[PDB]
Ligand binder design. Structure first.
Ligand SMILES: CCCCCCCCCCCCCCCC(=O)O[C@H](COC(=O)CCCCCCCC[C@H](C)CCCCCCCC)COP(=O)(O)O
Ligand SMILES: CCCCCCCCCCCCCCCC(=O)O[C@H](COC(=O)CCCCCCCC[C@H](C)CCCCCCCC)COP(=O)(O)O
Ligand SMILES: C=C/C(C)=C/[C@@]1(C)SC(=O)C(CCC)=C1O
Ligand SMILES: C=C/C(C)=C/[C@@]1(C)SC(=O)C(CCC)=C1O
Ligand SMILES: [K+]
Ligand SMILES: [K+]
Lengths: 415, 414
């Protein structure tokens, strides 16, 4: 008999605080109310760079409340953007958790990102080409390295039981929460800050993904552009975000008087070995990530009330994920695709969506998937649409997938 | 509580290794060269050195450049770390006898410091010159830092997870740690793991040397890298990449693979001290070593050998000596391979894990080069002068990284 959360072979792990910054709001509770009210964070892009380059994509969700409005003079000169976002969210989360005094030697941080401080690579490159090697900042390395945001949070909050950065492109944010769960259940930590951060919409990221022919170009109706699972979808839309949650053993939470929002029960990680940038059509390995999360949780597929889909609104992505949900035996779950409203934040998105999964369990409600108007027969899923779907949801799986063939599924439960 | 010794974790063995280094593309020749006291560190002849008059004019390029093995298409459609990952993954698999494994039980975990960053700057220049439609359609998949691990997973058919842990100079060891976790948690029976890294270039040298941590002993390049020596003056770049194949002992026995060593346990901690200096007290670094022992089921008295991260910076080696004391491992024989091979950043912990395996397999530790004046603050048994033979049974490989990351791996003789 394998250990599971249900059989007590793993310790119970609970989510005790959440924080996120999104295109709708810097306040996760206001993001959540806005989603439930059918709001979209997607807008016409007004940036100069759009007109400068005449970009084919002219839509996206910038953060409602820009990170750098909270940054001091020295932060702007000593950290890359994902580090600044990490420091902002790290401090917000800790305050939301009641600023607890925890044992630093039992406290881990696991934060994913898609790339790291890449703007400082191009900065350094230009500085050196113009003025030679002594023009490169002595801080360049530490601003650039992709583990930089996780390290800044570890330093800020004092985590001494490991600081890790898993990178798996668009599944990085969920993968980080999986590895944090593992670190606790293996006995390496009792409490962990985890999730994901990502850079803002800029011209070069738009250019590179646009050349994969991946992106929606419904520029005339920005809030209608992102249409996961809909027959008429035409690709993904960027929406900025960063998100963190605090997880800890149930015993640890109870000893300090924390009130859990949900339980994090198990995590599955698999890979397709199919193609570098398309998911396997059959959804079999993706489905097996979901199944592995259920095995570690001790659940059956019939237990799962809700799936928070990766749902990017590409034609081949959504079709693969529908197959994966069928493989896992989860296709009678109520499905939400939050990128319909919040867009795609790449290395942060799995973390944001994990936070939304937690709030669905806490509050008994799934927001409507925006723009879901014409069901697609290849996609026979129960996609929540039109108005929120209320229920006493007991268990839910959050899915995230990434270029490279990475599949991550996280199983959460109502507390 | 489970340990390897108590049977609570399955037994995991190392069954193949590959590496490319500044001494040789052939790990067995690297090893022979190390034992004979060879250095891979040379004067750098690159035009970029004189173009920028770099303060640092030494390092070790790969003896056999990755791209001498690469087709025209790969040169345009993979980043350098992807090309290195493809070359090494193919070599490792052939060395392992090209086994037919269950893909759904096979994982890949490969760390790197940065990823396909030359494609970032190239995409930036191409767009600045010609607009957004000049950026390659393959740019994202070449740039993404999971790119090398993903290339190897697709090449070899791994469907039980492809992971890229990033922890700067400890990434290559951290990859092997997480591969070990993936197998003992039951998610895989076999894994390819290790680390790749880019080559020495002008901008990397400028960025590290502006931190003031690099040796500039340009007069005597083979003498420059002096871990634990009293006169050390900073680290030296030495290119590498390394992968190993690990699998359950049951899996290896079933296919007739002869183990090279056992991978017994892994410890990961962090300092929360400074972004680019290790904690002077060595406490959390020593606890990484202690955790690898706890998971192995070993005590510090059992350890014969420590393969030190040993970068040759003044404050780095002092902190590590403290760490080895905190862990109770300071009676062990110490080797600092960066003395001969220099520092390969994201790859280096993987390379040094392969060297730890070979020490255990062959009963010998190479001499730490350039170790001439003991430093009283260090007070370690640094193997030097000639290789040291012995019946080594248990060894710890240490790796640390910017951000305060500490990774220790506990290996045993098979
Ligand atoms: C939801 C969006 C997600 C996008 C994800 C992309 C991930 C990349 C990380 C984003 C980059 C951070 C930028 C933050 C600072 C900032 O904004 O810099 C502006 C001006 O522009 C720049 O410096 C642009 C510099 C670009 C840096 C290189 C980016 C390369 C992108 C690749 C070519 C394509 C994407 C690779 C993704 C790989 C991983 C995921 C699969 C300062 O403005 P000012 O204050 O000077 O007026
Ligand atoms: C042991 C060394 C370790 C170094 C580690 C540094 C990280 C390496 C990053 C990958 C480097 C890949 C380079 C391969 C391409 C190549 O070689 O192309 C040259 C031409 O130059 C270039 O393109 C240089 C391109 C610059 C790339 C950006 C590098 C940014 C470096 C950062 C500012 C500093 C390092 C940050 C490290 C953070 C992570 C670890 C803490 C031949 O051109 P040709 O023969 O075709 O004419
Ligand atoms: C191996 C490839 C995969 C999983 C591709 C996916 C489904 S992941 C992702 O977020 C998107 C939209 C583009 C950012 C894909 O096209
Ligand atoms: C937190 C900082 C740490 C651990 C710094 C170390 C000791 S790790 C490393 O390889 C080097 C040499 C620079 C490549 C350090 O200076
Ligand atoms: K999701
Ligand atoms: K080492």
């Amino acid at each position: 008999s394998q250990p599971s959360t249900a059989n007590g072979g793993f310790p119970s792990v609970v989510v005790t605080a959440v924080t996120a910054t999104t295109s709708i709001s810097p306040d996760i509770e206001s993001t959540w109310k806005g989603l439930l009210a059918g709001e979209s964070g997607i807008h016409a892009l007004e940036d100069e760079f759009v007109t400068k380059w005449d970009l084919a994509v002219k839509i996206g969700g910038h953060l409602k409340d820009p990170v750098d409005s909270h940054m001091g003079r020295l932060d702007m000169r000593r950290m890359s953007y994902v580090q600044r976002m990490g420091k902002l969210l790290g401090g917000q989360l800790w305050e939301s958790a009641g600023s607890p005094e925890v044992d630093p030697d039992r406290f881990a941080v696991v934060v994913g990102t898609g790339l790291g401080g890449a703007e400082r690579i191009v900065e350094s490159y230009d500085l050196m080409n113009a003025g030679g090697p002594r023009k490169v900042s002595p801080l360049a390395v530490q601003m650039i390295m992709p583990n930089g945001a996780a390290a800044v949070i570890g330093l800020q909050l004092g985590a001494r039981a490991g600081v890790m950065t898993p990178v798996s492109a668009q599944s990085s944010g969920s993968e980080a929460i999986a590895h944090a769960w593992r670190q606790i259940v293996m006995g390496d930590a009792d409490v962990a800050v985890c999730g994901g951060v990502e850079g803002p919409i800029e011209a070069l990221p738009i250019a590179a993904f646009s050349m994969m022919r991946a992106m929606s170009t419904r520029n005339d109706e920005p809030e209608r552009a992102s249409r996961p699972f809909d027959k008429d979808r035409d690709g993904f839309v960027f929406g900025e975000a960063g998100a963190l949650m605090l997880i800890e053993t149930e015993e640890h939470a109870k000893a300090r008087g924390a009130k859990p929002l949900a339980r994090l029960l198990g995590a599955g990680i698999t890979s397709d070995a199919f193609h570098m940038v398309a998911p396997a059509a059959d959804g079999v390995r993706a489905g097996r990530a979901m199944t592995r999360s259920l095995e570690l949780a001790g659940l059956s597929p019939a237990d799962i009330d809700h799936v928070n889909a990766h749902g990017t609104a590409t034609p081949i992505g959504d079709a693969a994920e529908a197959n994966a949900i069928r493989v896992a035996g989860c296709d009678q779950a109520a499905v939400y695709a939050p990128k319909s409203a919040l867009g795609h934040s790449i290395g942060a998105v799995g973390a944001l969506e994990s936070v939304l999964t937690v709030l669905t369990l806490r509050d008994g409600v799934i927001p409507p998937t925006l723009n879901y108007e014409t069901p697609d027969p290849e996609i026979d899923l129960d996609v929540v649409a039109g108005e929120p779907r209320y229920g006493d949801y007991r268990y839910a799986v959050n899915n995230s997938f990434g270029f490279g063939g990475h599949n991550v599924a996280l199983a959460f439960g109502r507390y």
